[model samples]
Target: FPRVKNWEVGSITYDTLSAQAQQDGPCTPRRCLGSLVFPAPEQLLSQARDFINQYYSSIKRSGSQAHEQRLQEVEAEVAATGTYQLRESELVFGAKQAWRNAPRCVGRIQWGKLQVFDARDCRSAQEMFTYICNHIKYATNRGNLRSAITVFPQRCPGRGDFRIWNSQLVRYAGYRQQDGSVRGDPANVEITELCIQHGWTPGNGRFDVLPLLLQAPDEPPELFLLPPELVLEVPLEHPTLEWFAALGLRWYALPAVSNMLLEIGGLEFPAAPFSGWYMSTEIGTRNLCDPHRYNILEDVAVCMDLDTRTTSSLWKDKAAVEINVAVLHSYQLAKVTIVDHHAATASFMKHLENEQKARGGCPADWAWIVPPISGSLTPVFHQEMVNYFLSPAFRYQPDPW
Candidate 1:
């Protein structure tokens, strides 16, 4: 039998995370304020047992019988079929927990409402395309984008994994111009280039939704275009700034991250694309501000007639604020879903308080918990957080060639 270590039982505290931040790009193990190690298979089984039992108790069912039953079934099925099926309730619970355990997300408050579509029986890339299109349609929901995850087949021994090679279901095409510049989202240049190499006729627009690079087990990858109507988009604009709409910037309704792997109970689903509505900062701050991305902060600043001559002018900062404001405004005007970092982080604190009351503690990564733009202004800045490996988690995976 293995031992279980709950958050309250095993959380590690540090004097300060800022001390570690002194040497940071990404957090290293040595620099980590606190870290968690999950149990081995032997220990994991025992933890799973406790998890099932506790889950039953939370739902007003007392006893180890349901726990023992699931454990017995898992063992028996594994011995016979090399894998086991999850009960629908277990599947739902795992999907929600995966969302909750997602470290980078500020929208964990909506974890329980995610629509999880299990497509473990999909046998071909065509089927996967259908599943993806279906996910986009449902998640887009006209103008009201909803959080969702579409899970594909799980990995098994001796099988090549299924994968969605694109980073997102809907992304702008990046065309490399003859002048050594990129025309659209530079972040997507590699994937966009790959699509061209794979016989995809590149569209001549900034907002062309790239085709999918769907790969199935034991075959070459296939490319499929998304149906136009399935994708909902918000055209960027500002209420008072007439010049802002002239920029012609737009974004898709749902930000469906396709490349990450979803691990549930030791089984890995490599093709699970999960989505949440946009957090304005993701678009306004990073996509528009990052030098490697759209990089429109200076242009936006110039348009606002701000002083871009010196760093003391805080022109970039001012432009960033307006860019974020525009993203929120545009999304709202279009009736598409989006959240500001302030509102999002506030709800996350509420989520943290709720989890503290229900589960004794919450797992969080301080590096990700803090907003990119306003570190000191948000509530999460003052709070210390601990990172842990919880089962049923979504994690970044290596890019598929």
Candidate 2:
């Protein structure tokens, strides 16, 4: 068992639940791989059995006839066809469990509130696009973003998988300029190039939204453009900084991750797209200020006329805070759902308390749970967390070229 501590409040807890972790992580007695982004599964029947037990237990029906009968039914189906299907209720429970089990998420406090859309019957890329558009419309809701996930068909044996080529449902295009400087989000340059190569008419602006690349089983990806009106965007502006709006900065209201694989009861759904409201620092600090991304810190700092010559001036820190303020202000001005880092971290602290009581322990990635900009300022930064793998989980899959 691992011991967790909150240095700020002198609280201590033992993570006995980690002993139940189904999969081995990248750590052993020699070294720890807790900080790695991608840590790189299972006997089908046993995994299915465990997940079925989990589903039944969630509804307080463990060891009951309904649970026992459900298990027997799963076994019979798998015995006959080598695979089984999840009931809609089971799928819903599993989807929320995956979100609750996600170690990297700071928004797990809202895990049980997710709207799970079953697209498991979808069979074509065109249909996948249709389902995705509806997901965006419903989740975005013009501004009040809601947490949701749409689960596509599971990966079948000897059959190609349904995939979303884009990492997210909405992302800005990146254009690699002739001079080697990127004109848009540099992180998306590869996807943008792929989009253009696959017949998308490239846009010349910095914030052009990329088209969707939806791939059905055994088929080449199909491109589908999102209706501009359906894609809610908030133009960023600072409350006090009048010139901030002059920068022409903006971001989409939705942060739907489309490329992750959802694993439930040993079944893998490669096209389950999930979305939640963004924490301001994710947009302000990482997206806008990361050197590999838009890298706009210096520009904003210069706009603020801070002392760029001296590191002691803390220009980057000052500028980053303003950018975060701008993100929060802009989202609120547009009536869009967004949380500031302070509120998000505080709520996550409550979530940790809730999970610790409910499940003996809560798996968390401290590096991810803490806000990017204000590390020590947030309550999560002072908390020591044990990270581990849990099933009914979301796992990252390789990019569908």
Candidate 3:
């Protein structure tokens, strides 16, 4: 934003000054240089000027084309997914901002809502939800609040001229209204047209504040609801270990564990021995073993095939099992001989670990979105409970355009 003026003035100046006629310009083939390089001074000098202008024009044109192409590609991909229909209010859950979207195409209606988040941009609807819930609970309401929070990187935004990037961070993500404009490192996250132009594939990518959920632990509650599976054979309360989110703290919940995975490599990459897999960022090779597979506790020695999903594992291909083991724990990890395959599990824990700074959060906020947020808690899981009250019989359809 700060460079806009300079960029505009420079761009205009070059446009007016660069519109000169030179036969052997960038548009021309190299052979068009003619006899220019000859010892004669004036001709060479003039040609040199033409060469500079020519190349400049070429670069400008290429860059312009690239930008346009990328934008369109992102737009088209958004359309195909029918995701454009997702607006901030809906995706975010508690956003006060109305829709803010770009102009519609000549023949088509733009369908998705796009949102942006600097590394601190996790404050959209769901983020807004996280903020409001936590604020009301811990701050205003005397810590009384209810509702689950979750993060969806592909989350959509308001579909109109809403510019929360400037207003919301200060209000929600910890920027102070008194501290002037908050710095929301825009590079942290965005949900715009990410297409061939932007090096993005369709569908899998969208720029929205990832969703965060808040929930409560279930009776004999399923720890997997923290949602990362148990890949190891150790208890959660293992010996000296670092919490993935904040290694400084000895114990970590799901969110912290998830964050540590990509940021710390879960102690694996730092060459530190981990007391538990949740504490170690040891992601197995993609095509190799899935580290989350576990053994059944009630069943004798049988590995829990249903508990994990390999790269090849999918809806129809997925399986489930019950096994017996010495013991089981939340987000635990271990490798031992079980009923079926020799199993293993690893997170991009090292990458997750690398993302942290001593004084700050992740290098990228959205990275937190795609992976785990601050703690083992995803924005959605922060609530300490998992209650999907929506009915399973029907789906939620948008009201209308």
Candidate 4:
């Protein structure tokens, strides 16, 4: 007896009563099924055009002949090829914009100066390996780190996409113990096992570097050894705390995230790795102190002769501050570029203020922007932010089989 459209009820007068019943039915539009839906091709074209518009506007080319010419070319390309390729200038701008739009990074002040490498024509895993190696050497800058990104070919229909499995180009090895424990970075145990299974000989030490696992679509993955000297590592020790050196902790100089997909214009590039200098808290607090990582808070507490028996003693808190201090001190002694959380957060607040006036809004993830150990102590902790997607953004992708 419910009202129906495409084919109507026989009686219009009777249908009014049926419509009222349908309005009060158990299953309504608000309570109906909702499911995942892919974007239409037109939607992708619109987003691509939006990104191009943003690009020209930022570079002060809006309404200029160059802007109109580039816009027409992009429109034509999308009409013919389903997607448009970014020019060298556009790619450069997009790469920086992606970093600037990065909600979690505390290092966006340097967003305008990123070095972008276009390795889109690479055809094999071996060649992809070379690009990553070069990015590492360049970005590391022998400890005077500079921000950089290397982009690979975009994803295409019916073709395998390029990918890098390692979370970062530089990562400490995690060796699984026969007794069901991990000796090094516990966070990397899974990938470490995969490396060993792929014929890489596992290193026995805590500071051993992990090999890169590179894959080209449809090709079997390949392993590439990182040349040790090309990597800059800081052997961490506190200046005043002699006992801290006995812990034998060390970390890679560059934090180049390798597995993220760089989405520009509606296309996905599964193999773009980007790097920036480390904020000390990333290494000292999360990497070293998180229970799932090296988990050394208790060990450090005992070494410092702090009360380890009770949470009320703030032993963990005391140890974390010293560990951060040691990380900053060690990097400084090595002449490496690193920012402490206090300075990093203060700079981020400044970046926010700049973006607010210029762009009208800034995207930020509050949980990630806040320092792990001293969230309340930092200014970003109190700030509210809205997170959204923009073109030329980096994203996490699932691991390759």
Candidate 5:
């Protein structure tokens, strides 16, 4: 068992659950790859066995006739067809388990509450767009955001995979300017360019929502524009700083990650788009302040009349805090579902305790679980966590270029 401790409160725990993790991470005796993202596979039968066992155990029917028969059923199907389909209940269970097993997520507290939409019947890019639009509408819920994942068809042998080119369901266009500077979110420059090349009329603006590049098996990606009315956005404004509204900054309410693969029972769904409501710092700190993103720290600092020349002035810190305040205030004012870092971390602390009692340990990436801003201010920052991969996981896939 791995020994875990919390430095702030002097608490200790043992992670016996990690022993069940079947895959070895990139880490070895010489180096640790725990901090890096992008980590995979199996003999289908063996993996199918483990997943069915897990499913049976979840329902407290571990060795019942139904469980035994289900195992045989999977074996026979795989033997004849070299692959098998998951029953609806099995798919639901696996989807939730994948979310629960995600080590990088801070919102695992809400794992069991996910709205899983199985789009396995999706056969074309047009059908994929319809499913995606419905997912956006349902998950957004007019700003009362709900956690959801829509699983597209699983990857099949000898067939091209269905894929969504955008990393997220909603993202702003990043136009490369004539002066060699980026006009919008630099993170999306490639996707934006791809859209333009694929017969999309480009919009030259900072926050133009990019169209979806949806691809079906053996077909070129098709672009579908998201209906603006369906995309809920929160216009950012500071409560006290009246001028903050004039900045004209806004962000979409939903953060649906569209490119991740959902793995269950050795089956891989390459087009599963998952989303949860935003954590304030994700938008306030990383999206707005990060140098590669909107990079609004200096702009906000200038408005606040901070001394940019001196590092000791702590201008960046002050500006960042206010920006975070703006995000929280704006979201609340707009009645959009958003969690502030403090509340999110506190809830995660409760989730840690709950997982400790329910499972021997919770798989967690400490760097990710802890809030990006004010890392030490959160309880998770003081807590030592065991990081490991668990089955029925959401895995990253290579860009479908």
Candidate 6:
């Protein structure tokens, strides 16, 4: 729901993105045009949903009947889009991780066969999430102008854990009838809390407790019917590895992310920290710029802490790792103390030269870049990525009766 609202705002902003030509010269418009089209929002949204769904859904996985049925549902839900069309076989993604097998920067090898996601024309999931947090408020006008409404939220419900609708605060509560039937008041509700119970059943979708988990209640209360608070605050965390296993995510395989690209008012989002997966290249269409060109077209910014010169390269390059990490953490980067800047640059040049030479269609400049990938549309890489995945611990919560 928040995703829907943020993109709506982003779409409005997209209409007015214009380049200032007088201030910048030299094919400025064309470059700006190229840059503006890099980050696309809706594509990211679709990809993210699919990604999250993939991680969460396991029953229909191995081409079984259920899998087939679920696939159809995904396709149908995507196809019903009116404002925009989504293309399959393509993906956009973001990630912030530290892996032991991360490739070494062998003097900038022409990246090949890597499943890198593009994020040129869109916002990173982090930015989009933040945007949704601010713009999407409770229902105000109470008219058809609203895009969606409260429905039989089988899992979320009369919305006990929800804080608002279209921006207004609401409440939630539960009660037991004389006949032993259970009931919940939709008005007694709260925000910044999610029910980890997996499903919302009848008579219960309220009561998100946030008391001191480390301490017991003041002499347990007289009401023996009330359930003990299961979730806690103070230290918010992603679902544990056990939860991931329960969701059927292959714990051994590198947990990659599929995500939304956020682009508000166009122009490459320089501030977003993100990543993506590009599944298929646009095949049928030949290059308009160069008939022989084949870019494997992409634009992404992996968590490369450039400013901080933070390098996590496992190759005893402590300084580079330090700088790279710093770059990710802070915008102001320190100078990198390279062991071999010459060897590095030359190696990169040769590698890219060879790869582009193989492709032979596009200019060599379109190949590997110094540290940044050639087609990097953004710079949200490295530790910035780690921060992005950390779901914000909302400082506020609403009342739930």
Please tell me which model should have the higher TM-score, number 5 or number 6. Answer: 5
RMSD, every candidate, angstroms: 5.9, 1.5, 25.8, 11.6, 1.3, 23.2
**What is the C-alpha lDDT profile of model 3 across 29-116, one tens digit per residue?**
3444222322033343343233223333434653466445543443454446522222232223211011111010110011122121
lDDT of 5 by residue, 1-401 (tens): 98999999999999999999978888888988777766422388888999999999999999999999999999898877789999999999999999999998888899999998989998789999999999999999998999999988888777999999999999999999998999989999999999999999999889999999999999999999999999999999999999999999999999999988889999989989999999999999999999999999999999999999998999999999999999999999999999988888888888889999988899999988988889998888989999998999988889988
| Candidate 4 CA-lDDT value | 0.80
Runs with alpha carbons beyond 4 Å of true place in candidate 4: 1-40
- Alpha-carbon lDDT of model 3: 0.21
Best-first order by lDDT: 5, 2, 4, 1, 6, 3
Of the pair 2 and 6, which is ahead by TM-score? 2
Which of candidates 3 and 6 is the stronger one according to lDDT?
Answer: 6
Q: Residue 380 lDDT in model 6?
A: 14
Give the runs in model 1 whose Cα sits over 4 Å from its true position: 1-30, 33-62
lDDT by residue for model 2 over 232-331, one digit each (tens)? 9999999999999999999999999988999998998988999999999999999999999999999999999999999899988999999999999999
Task: Tell how far residue 393 is off in model 3, in angstroms.
Answer: 26
Cand. 6 TM to true fold: 0.20
Candidate 1 has its poorest 10 consecutive residues by lDDT at 15-24
What's the distance in Å from true for residue 120, model 5?
A: 0.7
Candidate 5 lDDT for residue 181: 97
Tens digits of per-residue lDDT, candidate 4, 126-231, equal 8898888899889988888999999999887668988888888888888987898889998888888889999999889887799988988988778989998989
lDDT values of the candidates? 0.79, 0.92, 0.21, 0.80, 0.92, 0.23
Estimate candidate 5's alpha-carbon lDDT, on a 0 to 1 scale. 0.92
Candidate 5 residues lying further than 4 Å off, grouped into runs, are 39-42
| Tens digits of per-residue lDDT for model 6, 149-267 | 11110111121221111112111233444585333332222211222121223344323321110101122111111123211111111122122112111000001111112221111
Q: Give the distance in Å from residue 10's predicted Cα in candidate 3 to where it truly belongs.
A: 62
Question: How does residue 14 of candidate 5 score in lDDT?
Answer: 98
Candidate 5, residue 261: the lDDT equals 89
